[PDB]
Design a protein around this ligand. Structure first.
Ligand code: NAG
Ligand code: NAG
Lengths: 253, 253
DNA sequence: GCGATCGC
DNA sequence: GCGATC
DNA sequence: GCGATCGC
DNA sequence: GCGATC
């Protein structure tokens, strides 16, 4: 099973209405069984509708989805969108963590997976606020505890664009982040990875796993950023038109 | 007499050490009798030394100067530098306004001018904080009153990079700015001027005059931004390497 | 400092 | 058009 | 979100 | 290397 987290810069009607752009997004999305799409700025779900239409052109149930409400303290809101192949996994339950620790309160989905060692697991999504990256990543530790009590599940994948490097999270701040220091979690995407399509070299996008079953289901060395620029022979300009971030992915067995 | 205010993006040792860059700065500076240079990030005055050396290669007294101390609340400091031709004008007095209304407290120079209608006038320099543009421009009204009481002088020129347009000062904020609403002042650079070398079209840099004598000394239509890119046949890249702003200038008679 | 979209 | 973001 | 220098 | 800016 292939899972990815993808920050698609300002995913909305404008990008989904460009046929060239749409085609590349569709291509990327089709690589995965489960894909978290962040930065969905689509109050009426018109862009999301268009995407599913493309994905479901040959079989109406190729992909299904779960979408959060528009999240944000002020006028700037984003949804978390989970795309999944219904023949591979099912959604057992979902929940919106709500506390005010986060700009975009984490969306949590409990999945059933027939084809892998782990049979049931949750995914916690987070597109952190660049400005409050340290505190938010640190707050995810409490979300993990929450999920654990709510569903009696230890097998949890924490994923998204954490802004977890470069100017947002410096080297001296790591020690104050419980999600990082705790031995309960395994960070699949290392600090040395480059998850940006831009000129920077930053490990913004992360994949964090907790639980013995989930940890043992991970295929060694499968976790990495997917450089779509290199894969598809695009120019930097074309790559940036799709997104400023690369998806981060992992394979489960 | 020709007076200008020029924000030279990060004026410092790096820019002054590039001979091509230095040459263009020198060319620009030589157009004027009095020139306010902002964004001087030169704690030891090495860049300022180099500039004067160029300017004074043929006659040791071609240009003289007055420099403020490094100004700023925190670690980011800038000096205000006034370059003047000593055969044209003299410095009678200077003063550092100090209150905490400003990020970079205005430097004030009182000049003597033999060749023009106005014989004595002050120049108030301000490189406002982009973020607190409205309040700072509004605070200049109080500085004007200050100068007026200190020296019994009504002939005052307020100049610099006020960040007075586009996202920093919007249309609905103008009415709260006393320097703008008061009939005491004449705004020489209009809102329709473009003072940036970048792609934006903004009237950031301004020239404001108070006092009857000074107002009547102004040559009608002489006040404008000096587009050095167009003047010297530079590429956009070369122009931006010099500065992101154009000098604003005026002629007095 | 810059540039972009959304959602009014 | 422009504010709140990334 | 990005990129630049200074001044440690 | 990195924080405080523009
Ligand atoms: C799609 O976006 C790209 C990359 O930004 C193009 O430049 C193209 O202009 C857009 N769409 C067109 C009209 O088909
Ligand atoms: C001067 O700066 C320019 C413009 O940015 C050049 O690209 C040039 O590389 C610099 N100086 C050189 C070494 O002489």
């Amino acid at each position: 099973l292939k899972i990815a987290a993808f920050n698609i810069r300002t995913f909305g009607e404008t990008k989904m209405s460009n046929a060239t752009l749409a085609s590349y997004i569709v291509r990327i999305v089709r690589r995965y069984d489960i894909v978290l799409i962040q930065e969905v700025r689509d109050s009426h779900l018109v862009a999301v509708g268009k995407l599913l239409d493309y994905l479901n052109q040959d079989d109406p149930n190729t992909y299904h989805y779960v979408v959060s409400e528009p999240l944000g303290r002020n006028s700037y809101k984003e949804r978390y969108l989970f795309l999944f192949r219904p023949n591979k996994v099912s959604v057992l339950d979902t929940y919106q963590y709500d506390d005010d620790s986060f700009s975009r309160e984490p969306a949590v989905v409990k999945f059933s997976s027939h084809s892998t060692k782990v049979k049931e697991f949750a995914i916690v999504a987070l597109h952190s606020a660049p400005s409050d990256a340290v505190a938010e990543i640190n707050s995810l530790y409490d979300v993990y505890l929450d999920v654990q009590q709510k569903w009696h599940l230890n097998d949890v994948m924490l994923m998204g664009d954490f802004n977890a490097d470069c100017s947002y999270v410096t080297s001296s701040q790591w020690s104050s982040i419980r999600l990082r220091t705790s031995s309960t979690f395994q960070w699949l995407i290392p600090d040395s990875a480059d998850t940006t399509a831009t000129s920077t070299n930053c490990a913004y996008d992360r994949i964090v796993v907790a639980g013995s079953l989930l940890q043992s289901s991970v295929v060694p060395g499968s976790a990495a950023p997917f450089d779509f620029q290199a894969a598809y022979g695009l120019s930097n300009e074309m790559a940036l038109a799709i997104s400023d971030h690369y998806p981060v992915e992992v394979t489960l067995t």
